[PDB]
């Protein structure tokens, strides 16, 4: 699986236990040193962002290589696998450990390994079940917003409604004398004022109750493990169902199956097959991240509190009202039942191997895998809707097929020469292939609910053009590694690899990589008689690795269709082309030290790494005068340097008690070395960041000083200039030359985590914490809720009432008619400490199952996920983001009770 001198972190099955999410990488936030995992949505159909030893490139992806049982997969396919089938998870964060897997092995690989049946004479059955709820985890951002009449008085005073207008003249006949809108619709012209009050100036509408809910979560599973004299099997079926926390629907529901099987046919051949399948239903809330008027957390913060989405009985209405609108705005349940969507995906993973051992020593091994998924989605827009722009309805069907095949063949030969010189050779071949496909077809113009096939729409100007997409790639690799070992205390590993990809041109597709590593067992040679210490191994490595994750057709100079008339065709220039595109080459030096004391009762590991990346694939931004947005190129280089260290112990006292703890830490320092055009620095436009030589990608902002107490204007520091009294010079006119690079970082430098666990006679309690410090984020929601210049129709912060006037002069918030800039007062400290899980179990005593041979195990749980976070970021979530906090889906706080009957 990996070398002996490598950097391997193995996570056991108990940390991959029942977790009530489909995103399995979020269960590893804080369990591996160096590997940092951050997810950006509480969406059930969300996929985590993993980075091992910092970011390695700027254009290509820095995701690891996810491998489930030899053949390599993607995280969406892993999301349809039952997590109760996984035996362990090895993370190989080295250049000598990742030397037989290569497609993006410079980012590290993640080896998921599935469970196999133990070989007892009586098989094992296990029935798991669970049920829980999920809620929003933060409410503090809407604790300092305005109320209804307070916002109306603030708007009337600031001159938004009129130049000479009062509160009653605005609230009476301008935006409450808009029964003129509700009197145009037959469904609700007799409900205004009777059971439907859309504008209510006396209460405050709870907009959090109208946009977010409490969502259930269920899972069930049943597994049969067994094994006779030669064969072994693990079969399993189960289902998972998670509902969306937000009122805009986004669920996840899968029915799974798994059959791992292994057998020894004779004394010469051993065969095996581990094959799985799934039927899955996804849906995503695709409005989070954009700023629409009444949607998301931006909608729970900014909607005025004198607009009522509820009826008189407390239920959610079908429509609400915003002033100036020409049709009523639909709420999220009505918009969900008038725009249906349904997906259905069928996934199958077939995977098999055969080992042949002809002579003593060498074993040949052949392995082949197929990964097929057929997805089929449907969308509607329902006819005869009164609050729509048309009485006609539309429909759209889509069919996806993604097929990925793989073949891999090794031949290992191990031997000794005299007594203590054990060599091992390994040569091998690897071929990966992929071919995807998308077909789509829509229709529109339907007038009935029942008559809505695609062949029943209008046939004139209501026709449209279908959809078709094709993608494909391939990889071919030849590798060989050699392990030499002395008697007990010296191991030396040497490996060569040739990689060829389909993503690069025919003269640049092949690259050669190598790795040399070593391990020295100091305890078994020098200090073999000791009182306290019990293990000491030193290990070091150096190897070069490639990265080839850009896109499939990024090196051709292409010409596409662009039709002008309907009589002839027309061609346009599509891309620019780069004939000299090739791999990105990362050389990593590693040096570690792994101790151990009190015979297992203190383990400590310390690592050091460099990881220099050359010929870095940047999607370089061409100037706008070329007519192209960007183009992939091999220009630039960027360094890292880091330490990471973990230590675990056991501090129990009595026979009954069992107390253990673990701690885990990583720090690194990014550094860019060469950009792309002879440039010293490059600022990414309206993102807030900058790439500079000798620094990480820092933030690039103006510095906010305060306000001017004599006139009320905002003030910014002039960079570089110092006044005569030592103070820094300010100015009140904004310009783009007031911006400078500030000493923050987009990628956080310090990650870590720590775990505690106590036990008793049965009753056990485990608590896991994760933390990230050094993380800053631009709070983009505070641009909208803390400005008096524009967007006065929305709800504002409560601090915009002590604004600078001619009477109120000693204050801190500026005058009204000013737009704010994106400067250092919108940059916030998003450094958090979470409580990831708090599982409390109680395995039932073995004396309870005495005469009955039908049962023989039972456990219960009381699990709470994300129930505590400590940070100083005021934006519903510090983890859900990365460079900005837009209209975001916050994470979930979940309470789950389960049961397990093992019999």
């Amino acid at each position: 699986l990996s070398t002996v001198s490598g950097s391997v972190a193995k996570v056991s099955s108990e940390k991959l236990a029942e977790k009530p999410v489909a995103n399995i990488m979020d269960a590893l936030q804080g369990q591996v040193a160096g590997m940092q995992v951050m997810t950006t949505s509480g969406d059930p159909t969300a996929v985590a962002s993993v980075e091992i030893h910092g970011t390695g490139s700027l254009g290509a992806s820095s995701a690891p290589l996810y491998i489930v049982d030899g053949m390599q997969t993607s995280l969406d396919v892993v999301a349809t696998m039952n997590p109760n089938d996984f035996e362990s998870m090895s993370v190989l964060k080295d250049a000598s450990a990742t030397s037989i897997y290569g497609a993006r092995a410079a980012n590290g690989v993640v080896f998921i390994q599935t469970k196999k049946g133990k070989m007892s004479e009586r098989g094992r059955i296990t029935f798991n079940a669970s049920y829980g709820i999920s809620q929003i985890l933060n409410t503090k951002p809407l604790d300092n917003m305005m109320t209804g009449d307070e916002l109306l008085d603030f708007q009337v005073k600031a001159g938004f409604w009129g130049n000479n207008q009062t509160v009653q003249k605005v609230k009476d006949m301008i935006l409450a004398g808009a029964e003129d809108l509700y009197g145009n619709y037959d469904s609700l012209k007799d409900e205004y004022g009777k059971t439907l009050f859309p504008v209510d100036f006396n209460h405050d509408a709870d907009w959090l109750k109208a946009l977010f809910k409490t969502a259930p979560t269920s899972q069930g599973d049943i597994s049969f493990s067994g094994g006779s004299q030669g064969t072994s099997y693990y079969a399993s079926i189960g289902y998972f169902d998670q509902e969306g926390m937000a009122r805009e629907p986004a669920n996840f529901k899968r029915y799974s199956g798994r059959l791992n099987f292994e057998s020894r046919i004779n004394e010469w051949l051993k065969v095996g097959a581990n094959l799985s399948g799934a039927i899955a239903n996804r849906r995503s809330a695709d409005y989070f991240g954009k700023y629409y008027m009444g949607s998301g957390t931006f909608g729970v913060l900014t909607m005025p509190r004198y607009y009522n989405p509820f009826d008189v009985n407390g239920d959610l209405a079908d429509v609400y009202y915003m002033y100036g609108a020409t049709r009523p705005s639909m709420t999220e349940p009505y918009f969900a039942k008038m725009r249906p969507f349904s997906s259905e995906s069928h996934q199958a993973n077939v995977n098999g191997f055969a080992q042949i051992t002809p002579i003593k020593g060498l074993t040949l091994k052949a392995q082949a895998g197929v990964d097929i998924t057929n997805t089929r989605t449907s969308s509607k827009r329902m006819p005869n809707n009164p609050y729509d722009s048309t009485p006609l309805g539309e429909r759209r069907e889509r069919a996806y097929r993604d097929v990925s095949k793989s073949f891999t063949n090794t031949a290992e030969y191990k031997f000794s020469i005299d007594e203590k010189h054990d060599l091992t050779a390994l040569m091998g071949h690897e071929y990966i292939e992929y071919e995807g496909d998308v077909i789509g077809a829509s229709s529109k113009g339907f007038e009935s609910d029942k008559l809505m096939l695609l062949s029943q729409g209008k046939t004139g100007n209501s026709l449209s053009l279908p959809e078709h997409r094709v993608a494909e790639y391939a990889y071919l690799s030849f590798f060989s590694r050699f392990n030499y070992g002395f008697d007990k205390w010296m191991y030396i590993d040497f490996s060569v690899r040739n990689d060829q990809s389909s993503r690069f041109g025919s003269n640049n597709r092949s690259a050669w990589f190598y790795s040399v590593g070593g391990m020295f067992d100091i305890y078994n040679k020098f200090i073999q008689e000791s009182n306290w210490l019990s293990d000491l191994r030193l290990k070091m490595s150096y190897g070069t690795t490639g990265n080839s994750e850009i896109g499939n057709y990024n090196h051709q100079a292409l010409v596409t269709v662009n039709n002008y008339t309907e009589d002839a065709m027309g061609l346009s220039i599509s891309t620019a082309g780069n004939p000299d595109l090739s791999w990105e080459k990362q050389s990593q030096f590693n040096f570690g030290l792994a101790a151990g004391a009190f015979n297992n009762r203190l383990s400590a590991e310390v690592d050091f790494y460099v990881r220099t990346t050359n010929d870095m694939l940047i999607d370089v931004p061409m100037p706008y005068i070329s007519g192209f947005f960007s183009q992939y190129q091999n220009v630039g280089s960027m360094k890292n340097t880091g330490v990471d260290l973990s230590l675990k112990g056991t501090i129990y006292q009595n026979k009954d008690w069992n107390v253990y703890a673990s701690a885990n830490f990583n720090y690194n320092r990014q550094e860019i070395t060469k950009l792309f055009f002879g440039l010293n620095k490059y600022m990414l436009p309206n993102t807030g960041t900058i790439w500079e030589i000798g620094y990480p990608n820092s933030f690039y902002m103006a510095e906010y000083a305060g306000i001017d107490k004599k006139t009320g204007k905002q003030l910014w520091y002039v960079p570089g200039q110092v006044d005569a009294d030592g103070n820094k010079v300010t100015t009140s006119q904004y310009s783009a030359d007031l911006e400078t690079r500030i000493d923050k970082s987009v990628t956080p430098p310090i990650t870590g985590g720590f775990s505690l666990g106590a036990s008793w006679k049965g009753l056990s309690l485990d608590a896991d914490f994760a933390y990230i410090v050094g993380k800053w984020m631009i709070n983009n929601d505070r641009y909208f809720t803390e400005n008096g210049g524009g967007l006065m129709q929305l709800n504002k912060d409560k601090m915009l009432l002590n604004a600078w006037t001619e009477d109120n002069k000693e204050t801190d918030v500026p005058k009204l008619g000013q737009s704010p800039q994106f400067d250092t007062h919108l940059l916030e400290n998003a450094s958090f400490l979470r409580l990831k899980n708090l599982k409390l179990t109680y395995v039932l005593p073995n004396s309870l199952f005495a005469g009955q041979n039908v049962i023989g195990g039972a456990r219960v749980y009381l699990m709470a996920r994300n129930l505590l976070t400590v940070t100083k970021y005021k934006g519903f979530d510090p983890e859900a983001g990365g460079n900005v906090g837009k209209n975001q889906y916050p994470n979930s706080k979940q309470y789950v009770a389960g049961i397990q009957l093992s019999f």
Partner: peptide
């Protein structure tokens, strides 16, 4: 939704 409100910053990484 409707009437997208503006002056947002683009997100790299």
């Amino acid at each position: 939704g409707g009437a997208t409100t503006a002056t947002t910053t683009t997100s790299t990484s």
